[PDB]
Amino acid sequence: DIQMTQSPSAMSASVGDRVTITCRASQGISNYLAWFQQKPGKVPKRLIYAASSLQSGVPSRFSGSGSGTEFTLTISSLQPEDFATYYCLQHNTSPSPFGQGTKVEIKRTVAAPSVFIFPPSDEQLKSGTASVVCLLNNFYPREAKVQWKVDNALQSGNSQESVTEQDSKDSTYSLSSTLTLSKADYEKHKLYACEVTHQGLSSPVTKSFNRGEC
Amino acid sequence: YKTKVPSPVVKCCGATQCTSKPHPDYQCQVFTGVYPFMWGGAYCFCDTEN
Amino acid sequence: QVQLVESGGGVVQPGRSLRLSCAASGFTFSSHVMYWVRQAPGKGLEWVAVITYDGGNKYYADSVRGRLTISRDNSKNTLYLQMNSLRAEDTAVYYCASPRGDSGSYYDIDYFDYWGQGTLVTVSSASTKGPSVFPLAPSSKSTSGGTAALGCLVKDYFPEPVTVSWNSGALTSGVHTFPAVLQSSGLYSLSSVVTVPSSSLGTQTYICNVNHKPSNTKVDKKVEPKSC
Amino acid sequence: DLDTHFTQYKLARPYIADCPNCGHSRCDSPIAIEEVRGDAHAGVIRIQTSAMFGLKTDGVDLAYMSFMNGKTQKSIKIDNLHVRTSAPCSLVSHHGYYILAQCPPGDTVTVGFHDGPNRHTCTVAHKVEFRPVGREKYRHPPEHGVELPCNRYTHKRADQGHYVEMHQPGLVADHSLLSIHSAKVKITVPSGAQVKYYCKCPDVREGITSSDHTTTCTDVKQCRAYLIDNKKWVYNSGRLPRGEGDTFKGKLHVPFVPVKAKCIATLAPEPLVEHKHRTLILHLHPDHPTLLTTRSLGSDANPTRQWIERPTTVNFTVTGEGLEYTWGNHPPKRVWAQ
């Protein structure tokens, strides 16, 4: 089948910046290609077709280029409403695959996460499960590494992470990592630690508690 | 009279059931095992399903 | 105005069947090509299928071929997606879409201009379950620079969504309600957190209001510092 | 004027079908003959060929012809267009798909220009018989004689008495599209076309695409190249595979509809009467087989009708009631007796 490859998968840009998104088809598609903007929670909206025909009612700042296998969307001056996910689509053949999408996020200054750790509640422990939560609050860029340590042993496969969308006011991210253990395994160990690595931190920040300490 | 024959329809593989049109003396029939050559070579290679 | 309206989405068990519908209005439905596109939670768009104006040709992504069947009823202005042998990977919002409102037999170059709001299909063996709500108590370990963090863990519910508010919606500043994670149990879990002045912990009451409409569950959980 | 016929002039496309007797055997000629209509009187024939006469690609003309060689309409000056029968004919006028010609009697009709390096002719088995209007079974329209209300095809073209269908062309096959790149087969499109890719190997069977290439299959003889050219439309011919879609509309007016004209009919030589007692001796010297009809004027009609070709003398019993006879196309006359 045809495959559509978008580069980059994500990018950070400022208002007024020139943004250039590249899409590559695995086989020639002449110029039968289109570009779509999707905002969080919304339906996609088409911006360009025929690899350069600007959609009626779409701003003149959007432009398209290329033919055969290599194609581009160029935003000449990025506006605040343009922070969204952009997809290419080939429409030369059926099946008509989309690209992976390119996420355009708001570039801001580096912000170090505020790191917090929450022990499991006594109510949860009565149910036979322990959830330990590590919160990384209001950081940028989105790339953060969370590493759980239990009695200094590195944990693997027993945590799940969730990340907010970019904050509309401060352009930061927040991340929640949840370590889930059985009550029996939680009661075997004493030191619970969340180690955070982020570009805004000169060294990894560890937050920890001892089980049964206040 | 005049026998107006519309262009016949051909599917490469698998049959095609006809419908009784309201045309006067509308005679419809299906043929199987045809292997029509036309213009640039053969039309299909489903030698029995044509 | 052109409208497309998807329906028939919901929770279905793996291996079962579901039929989506899309009602069309404001254009000559019987003259135009119709398409299904899906989007898995937090993933990119995936092209599912297309059907011609007459229904005479039908095409499918290899991921869905032999399991999904696109059909239409031009007399009812209605598009259908029959889904059989559903898998967890088929969990997505399914969008009904068409090109610009101009016709053809087996040709199209205006792919995807008009779309519906989408319908959620969740393929899971999980039954409807209300959340357990646990406090994320503020502590010396959840305090930084005169700011304390506190929250609620909303654990083991199905299906989505839950809604979380703080102090009946009076507290909105510094609130982060995280996207739900699907646990290995097939149940969802999320946290909602808020940052507050550490000086307020002794004087201000913090209550998370959790509402899970699918199970009719409402829980108001007071979050207090753990007494030593 | 001439350019007020854009519906057939602009939209139609010269199609190619399976001539039954294309030169030696049944090839696929661009002038595949269809619907020979020799139903007139004076011997004028309307032929609906597969080529499109008159209009150059560049809008309109009349000294030019558009016929389809390959995937393109290689239009040329019409120069030596034959219309043959038992003896070669003399064409009258040509308009798009149709060409009106006058032929002598025969059993086969053949059409063909001769583009010069090649002939590209076509024939078809269809008897052509020419009954002159009137009572005399003549062969050719004579120089003089009486005239009768015949029926034939007008040489005029700007008429809309009747219409014919014209819808999207079907999926024409073209093997020459399945080239190879020494590793896999390469498909091609000349301009704006949208070909269909199909191959025997287990692969994507649908393959609707512009310029593109096969996934895995490699054997050219194990593939199909169908070509789509829906920009123009063709006549609803019975020798062309139907398009799988809708019957696109557009009524092409028939250039030469039958009309009720006046043809010159032959005039048999005058009979030599010789009166006899209650008997009408009639000397006849026909030039061509002519009908002779007579009837008694009395209570009993007593009809008599018999073709006469060789000169002969016939006699009739003219009673006192009276007798009437119509020799050839002459006006009827009457007689007494004593």
DSSP string for residues in D227-251: E--TTSBEE--TTSPPPSS------
Task: Name which of A96, A124, A161 is nearest C134 (Cβ-Cβ).
Answer: A124
Which three-class secondary structure state does DSSP give residue A46?
strand
β-bridge pairing A10-13 and A102-106: parallel
Q: Which residue, chain included where needed, has tokens 């009747």?
A: D162
Residues A119 and A131: their CA atoms lie apart, in Å, by: 7
**Which of D113, D106, D94, D102 is CA-nearest to residue D48?**
D94
Q: Do D245 and C56 touch (CB under 8 A)?
A: yes
Taking the Cβ of residue B46 and every Cβ of chain D, the question of whether any pair is shorter than 8 Å is answered with no
Burial of residue A41 (number of CB atoms within 10 Å: 0-12, 13-18, 19+): exposed
Residues C46 and C66: their CA atoms lie apart, in Å, by: 17
Contact flag for C and B (3+ C-beta pairs < 8 Å):
no
CA D182, D183, D184, D186 dihedral sign is: negative
- Cα(first)–Cα(last) distance of chain D, in Å? 67
Choosing among D191, D197, D209, D216, which should be mutated to test the A contact, i.e. which has the most A CBs within 10 A?
D209
Residues C79 and C114: their CA atoms lie apart, in Å, by: 14
Q: List all residues 6 or more positions away from A128 whose beta carbon is below 8 Å from its beta carbon.
A: A182, A183
Three-state secondary structure string covering chain C: CCEEEEECCEEECCCCCEEEEEEEECCCHHHCCEEEEEECCCCCEEEEEEECCCCCCEEECCCCCCCEEEEEEHHHCEEEEEECCCCHHHCEEEEEEECCCCCCCCCCCCCCCEECCCEEEEECCCCCECCEEEEECCCHHHEECCEEEEEEEEEEEECCCCEEEEHHHCECCCEEECCCEECCCCCEEEEEEEEEEHHHCCCCCEEEEEEEHHHCEEEEEEECCCCC
Contact C18, A73 (CB under 8 A): no
φ and ψ at residue C25, rounded to 5 degrees: -155, 160
Alpha helices in D27-132 (DSSP H): none
Q: Do A131 and C155 touch (CB under 8 A)?
A: yes
Indicate left, alpha or beta for C96 from its phi (over 0: left) and psi (-120 to 50: alpha): beta
Resolution in A: 4.6
Q: How far is C106 from chain D (nearest CA, A)?
A: 7
Q: Do C54 and D245 touch (CB under 8 A)?
A: yes
Residue type, D282: L
Q: List all residues 6 or more positions away from A203 whose beta carbon is below 8 Å from its beta carbon.
A: none
φ and ψ at residue D103, rounded to 5 degrees: -125, 155
Q: Do D225 and B40 touch (CB under 8 A)?
A: yes
β-bridge pairing A19-25 and A4-7: antiparallel
Output the six-digit token pair for A73.
């969307």
DSSP secondary structure string for all residues of A77-118:
S--GGG-SEEEEEE-SSSS-PBP--EEEEE----BPPEEEEE
Choosing among B1, B2, B5, B7, which should be mutated to test the D contact, i.e. which has the most D CBs within 10 A?
B7
Q: Do C50 and A97 touch (CB under 8 A)?
A: no
Contact C23, C77 (CB under 8 A): yes
Output the six-digit token pair for C44.
């990119």
Q: How far is D191 from chain A (nearest CA, A)?
A: 11
Output the six-digit token pair for D331.
């006006």
Residues C67 and C49: their CA atoms lie apart, in Å, by: 12
Residue type, B5: V
DSSP annotation of D270 reads P
Residues D200 and D217: their CA atoms lie apart, in Å, by: 7
Q: How many CA atoms lie within 13 A of D169 on its CB side?
A: 21
**Which of C38, D236, B30, C50 is CA-nearest to residue A94?**
C50
Q: Do D224 and B45 touch (CB under 8 A)?
A: yes
DSSP annotation of D213 reads B
DSSP annotation of A124 reads H
Task: Name which of C117, C139, C147 is nearest A43 (Cβ-Cβ).
Answer: C117
Contact A164, A40 (CB under 8 A): no
φ and ψ at residue C120, rounded to 5 degrees: -85, 125
Indicate left, alpha or beta for C181 from its phi (over 0: left) and psi (-120 to 50: alpha): beta
Contact A107, A13 (CB under 8 A): yes
Please confirm whether the linkage preceding D303 is cis (ω < 30° from 0): no
* Angle value at C-alpha A192, between A186 and A198, nearest 5 degrees: 135
In order of A205, D183, D197, D241, the CA distances from D200 in angstroms are 62, 17, 11, 22
Task: Name which of D208, D211, D212 is nearest A94 (Cβ-Cβ).
Answer: D208
Q: Which residue, chain included where needed, has tokens 């160990």?
A: A189
Q: What is the number of residues in chain B?
A: 50
Choosing among D246, D247, D248, which should be mutated to test the C contact, i.e. which has the most C CBs within 10 A?
D246
**Which of D263, D259, D281, D260 is CA-nearest to residue D272?**
D281
* Angle value at C-alpha B15, between B10 and B19, nearest 5 degrees: 85
Residues C210 and C168: their CA atoms lie apart, in Å, by: 10
> Long-range contact list for C179-184, CB < 8 A, 24+ apart?
C179/A162, C179/A163, C179/A164, C179/C42, C180/A162, C181/A160, C181/A161, C181/A162, C181/A178, C183/A160, C183/A180, C183/C156
DSSP annotation of D304 reads E
φ and ψ at residue D7, rounded to 5 degrees: -60, -45
B&D contacts, CB < 8 Å: 53
Residues D241 and D239: their CA atoms lie apart, in Å, by: 7
Contact A96, C50 (CB under 8 A): yes
Q: Do D224 and B12 touch (CB under 8 A)?
A: yes
Task: Name which of A1, A32, A94 is nearest D210 (Cβ-Cβ).
Answer: A32
Contact C166, C191 (CB under 8 A): no
Indicate left, alpha or beta for A38 from its phi (over 0: left) and psi (-120 to 50: alpha): beta
Contact D83, D74 (CB under 8 A): no
**Which of D45, D21, D46, D37 is CA-nearest to residue D121?**
D21
Output the six-digit token pair for D12.
């139609």
Output the six-digit token pair for C73.
């009823």
